[PDB]
Design a protein around this ligand. Structure first.
Ligand SMILES: COc1ccc2c3c1O[C@H]1C[C@@H](O)C=C[C@@]31CC[N+](CCCCCCCCN1C(=O)c3ccccc3C1=O)=C2
Ligand SMILES: COc1ccc2c3c1O[C@H]1C[C@@H](O)C=C[C@@]31CC[N+](CCCCCCCCN1C(=O)c3ccccc3C1=O)=C2
Ligand SMILES: *[C@@H]1O[C@H](CO)[C@@H](O[C@@H]2O[C@H](CO)[C@@H](O)[C@H](O)[C@H]2NC(C)=O)[C@H](O)[C@H]1NC(C)=O
Ligand SMILES: *[C@@H]1O[C@H](CO)[C@@H](O[C@@H]2O[C@H](CO)[C@@H](O)[C@H](O)[C@H]2NC(C)=O)[C@H](O)[C@H]1NC(C)=O
Ligand SMILES: *[C@@H]1O[C@H](CO)[C@@H](O)[C@H](O)[C@H]1NC(C)=O
Ligand SMILES: *[C@@H]1O[C@H](CO)[C@@H](O)[C@H](O)[C@H]1NC(C)=O
Ligand SMILES: *[C@@H]1O[C@H](CO)[C@@H](O)[C@H](O)[C@H]1NC(C)=O
Ligand SMILES: *[C@@H]1O[C@H](CO)[C@@H](O)[C@H](O)[C@H]1NC(C)=O
Lengths: 529, 529
């Protein structure tokens, strides 16, 4: 039977799912690690023990324990990111969509969800892999990993909570895909890992980590890169946050062993209730438990690894969205609200920059403000709002990715860069937020192909070409069918294309002006002062 | 006789001069101080002792001793600034052009020449006051003052070379004009002092100095302001330069008395031959002997005087030229030459910024470079050349004047601001230099009215309206005839007009973007680092 597959871990039985008036097979909720519960909370994952019998993989698995957004109860723009299954620490499962009839050896794509390292689920409607698997004939896998304290609490030097275990969950799932995907018809020699925001940073982290490199062939990074300022902390800051979490829960803080044992007796929700209390600054776009530069998963600093070429050399395809910062200003900066145009006063602009670059002294804050203020028209509300949107997006997503791409390209085997700037016709968020962080995903997963979702015909065509670029790149290392050509991004030319409903345009040096400020000048400034 | 005038210092006999097919009287070379020679070199000026008999004022006086430009021997663009009379330390004289028939009590304008405080003459063809005096019926005076070491060598605490004596020469001439101009038909209650570059800085210095304020009514500042970074030094730097000058001449340096006595035995040319050797840095737009912040002529720092309103409150008219920096890049920055288009490489650009902001550390130099570089096109020769031209002009002339005008306007009684951007049709300098520092003067003095000078009819009309704005402002405190109106510059609106052959346009906040960088951000940066 097409729905029965035997893997090195045991037999698995899938389910047939309808897709665009056709059908494909789905194997949902395949376990790839032992549940990380009880004394295993905070520990590195252990491989799933093989099972006899047939594992029922007909339904989505639980989602990992996480902070649930309740800012706009029932609003679809925000609930589309919230867990849609029950949450459980028993959440280490993967999902596979397989074309029908089963391929023999085809292109594999493995999705790594984002969520700021503190949230996320592989089961969201926006990550439904049936459209992509069906339309491009690829075996599509979505993995899962622990987020928040459960995946990233770090007490470096302790083997009970070493940090980075969420990244190790991802690696374990990639090892399982490497060892078993051939049974589902996937070609393990051709696995492309792809992810957005924290998922895109994770993808770049596996490109860097010696221990992950061999598990995949090629990589796609959407609005995220490993060097993002919010994506990792030092072992001292990780330790400090872990100690502060224990302090919020009245834990004995005398030793790592005491702290961890106390943290392990708390119910999941007790940790999540105080998670946000451990941030060191009043800030925006900063999350509590994230990857740690440990000297193990990451042998040295990310910058020295990038500079010395200490990373997997292969082809990468990556890019950013036009207004990466809006989501974060809406949720925490003064002056922004969901139901108004959010024109920002000069004062709220200034308090917004302070929240945006929490690690900056006053000279640094003045430098940012001068860089983004039109002084011939400093009280312009739209300009202050949009300028702050650019500050947040440039500092947190765009310039870190441009720095990653110029460093990578020096040693890599091929880079394709995009700038996604299409505002979906059916977006439920306000106009002022523009092309929001995360809103290219629905195009990558082919949602515009389903009529009931209300996209335009040009949006369906945009989705079809993005999926075909993504799969052709996964298959060959080049998004172009051997029609308008997406040129290679090179060190000298730095070309990239716009991704939207208009005829392809090629440009060069994506936001160079602002990124020289964020990547070269500001750090020199903060370091000197 | 119309050419005979009796003054409190004695009788003076002038000469009749032809002007635009008419005639006026000129009283040239009237002494206003005792020759500052021998033991009087470096000392404050002494008033001219009255004389019996008739002083022959029919011919131009000698020019003060100064460094003579020999970069382009015989080239008119540069020789028009060089002394055109013999040089002598006996050079403290003033010139007066008087309408014919002699007015009874008319508007007086007193010109203070520029020359970086190290050169300049009241007798240059470009400062011929007959056209302005004739066309606008004003009594036009040009004074003179010691420049270079002779006017500004400063050993604060010594009464033999206290510094600022060149400014005291100007003040003495203003005192003479106040006490005697009524005999020439001028109204001493209505004297407007006007000057360009170092002359415009000098004008702002008399507006600030308690001891000069009462000697005039109103002021015009062209491309110069008192707070220019090149226009003054501290008493410690003045002392250091004075000591270094003595060191270049093998002087005994044991005491001020020893140093001064040695400097007084040197011929004028011996001091000038080593003058440039005392600058502290490799720089551009910095001159050896300039005004000193002494606690006497200037009671406290210029900034605190500006901030507290410690200055004459009256009406001022002032402005800048479009390419103030070109003259200085031509003369010393690498890559610039008189006979080429001077497209500048990225490297020469960087060495140009280092020369331009000599007092800056590396972080400061990076800030300037990032502020003026188009990073999407950093190897563009024209852009690098023009960007450096703007850096030099903004740092040395434009932003210091904008800072002066916004501070002044808070306490003053009326401000009119202009931006002069007409490139004269007969300019002999290359096209790349644009609207050069000093090239609005010929329009202010009405040179375009003389046909043989080859200006266009629209340039003659531009000259006529500038002279009429200048004289009407001198007469009433408002350049407008009680036709298009030059609006008042106010703290809130900051309006200014373009001055050129096109129909008047009004704009606001002259180069605000760049001047926030030069006046607020960079100094905070240099102060913190
Ligand atoms: C760096 O990429 C991300 C960080 C957070 C998220 C995402 C990210 O990518 C986004 C697109 C996709 O990858 C998945 C999740 C998204 C969208 C959904 N959501 C939840 C709704 C938006 C939240 C914005 C952050 C504000 C967060 N926030 C709190 O909710 C909060 C509660 C209490 C104290 C402090 C805070 C706080 O600062 C969060
Ligand atoms: C701040 O306004 C000025 C500073 C200098 C001058 C003027 C200024 O206003 C200009 C217009 C008007 O007011 C009068 C003079 C002008 C034009 C005529 N000129 C002479 C020719 C241009 C000189 C440019 C400065 C380079 C100077 N220079 C030397 O010549 C030199 C010799 C030896 C060592 C070092 C140097 C050096 O640095 C000099
Ligand atoms: C990616 O790597 C391949 C293989 O190493 C490169 O192809 C080689 O290109 C050189 C030219 O410099 C040829 O001499 C070799 O014969 C090629 N090898 C093969 C097997 O084709 C390719 O140029 C690289 N691509 C990029 C974008 O760097
Ligand atoms: C310059 O000063 C004059 C005189 O001090 C100002 O005129 C006065 O304006 C006030 C209005 O605030 C009137 O109440 C007075 O009666 C005016 N005095 C006279 C004698 O006219 C004038 O406003 C000032 N101009 C500027 C541009 O500041
Ligand atoms: C698999 O699980 C689903 C839902 O839990 C159930 O309805 C289905 O019948 C199961 N299949 C088998 C054979 O266990
Ligand atoms: C599509 O449009 C209909 C009618 O305009 C609306 O009621 C419906 O909720 C929309 N459906 C979705 C899934 O966006
Ligand atoms: C004034 O001086 C000039 C030139 O030195 C001379 O030609 C003229 O005759 C003099 N006038 C008198 C009366 O001294
Ligand atoms: C004016 O033009 C003539 C002929 O073009 C030229 O020879 C002369 O030198 C110019 N005169 C001046 C003073 O510029």
């Amino acid at each position: 039977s097409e729905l029965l597959v035997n893997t090195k871990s045991g037999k698995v039985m899938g389910t047939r799912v309808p897709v665009l008036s056709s059908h494909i097979s789905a194997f949902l909720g395949i376990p790839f690690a032992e549940p990380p519960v009880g004394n295993m909370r905070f520990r590195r994952p252990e491989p799933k023990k093989p099972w006899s019998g047939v594992w029922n993989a007909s339904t989505y698995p639980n989602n990992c324990q996480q902070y649930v957004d309740e800012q706009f109860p029932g609003f679809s723009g925000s609930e589309m990111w919230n867990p849609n299954r029950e949450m459980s620490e028993d959440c280490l499962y993967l999902n596979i969509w397989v074309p029908s009839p089963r391929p023999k050896s085809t292109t594999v794509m493995v999705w790594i969800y984002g969520g700021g390292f503190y949230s996320g689920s592989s089961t969201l409607d926006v990550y439904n892999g049936k459209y992509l698997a069906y339309t491009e004939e690829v075996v599509l896998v979505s993995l899962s990993y622990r987020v928040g304290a459960f995946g990233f609490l770090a007490l470096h030097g302790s083997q009970e909570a070493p940090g980075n275990v969420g990244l190790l969950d991802q690696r374990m799932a990639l090892q399982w895909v490497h060892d078993n995907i051939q049974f589902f018809g996937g070609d393990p020699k051709t696995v492309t890992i792809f992810g957005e925001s924290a998922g895109g940073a994770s993808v770049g982290m596996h490109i860097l980590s010696p221990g992950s490199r061999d598990l995949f062939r090629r990589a796609i990074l959407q609005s995220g890169s490993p060097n993002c300022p919010w994506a990792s902390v030092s072992v001292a800051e990780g330790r400090r946050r872990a100690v502060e979490l224990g302090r919020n829960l009245n834990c004995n803080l005398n030793s790592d062993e005491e702290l961890i044992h106390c943290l392990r007796e708390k119910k999941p929700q007790e940790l999540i209730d105080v998670e946000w209390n451990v941030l060191p600054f009043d800030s925006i776009f900063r999350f509590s438990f994230v990857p740690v530069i440990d000297g193990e998963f990451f042998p040295t600093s990310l910058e020295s690894m990038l500079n010395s070429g200490n990373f997997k050399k292969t082809q990468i395809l990556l890019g950013v969205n036009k207004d990466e910062g809006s989501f974060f200003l809406l949720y925490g900066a003064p002056g922004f609200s969901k139901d108004s145009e959010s024109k920002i006063s000069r004062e709220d602009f200034m308090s917004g920059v302070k929240l945006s670059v929490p690690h900056a002294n006053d000279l640094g804050l003045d430098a940012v403000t001068l860089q983004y203020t039109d002084w011939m028209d400093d009280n312009n509300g739209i300009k202050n709002r949009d300028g702050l949107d650019d500050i947040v997006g440039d500092h947190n997503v765009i310039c870190p990715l441009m720095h990653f791409v110029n460093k990578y390209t020096k040693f890599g085997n091929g880079t394709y860069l995009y700038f996604f700037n299409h505002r979906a016709s059916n977006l439920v968020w306000p106009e002022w937020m523009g092309v929001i962080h995360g809103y290219e995903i629905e195009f990558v997963f082919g949602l515009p192909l389903v009529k009931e979702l209300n996209y335009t015909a040009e949006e369906e065509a945009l989705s079809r070409r993005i999926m075909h670029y993504w799969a052709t790149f996964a298959k060959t290392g080049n998004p172009n069918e051997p029609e308008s050509k997406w040129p290679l991004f090179t060190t000298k030319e730095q070309k990239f294309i716009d991704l939207n409903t208009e005829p392809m345009k090629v440009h060069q040096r994506l936001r160079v002006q602002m990124c020289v400020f964020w990547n070269q000048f500001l750090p020199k400034l903060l370091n000197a002062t």
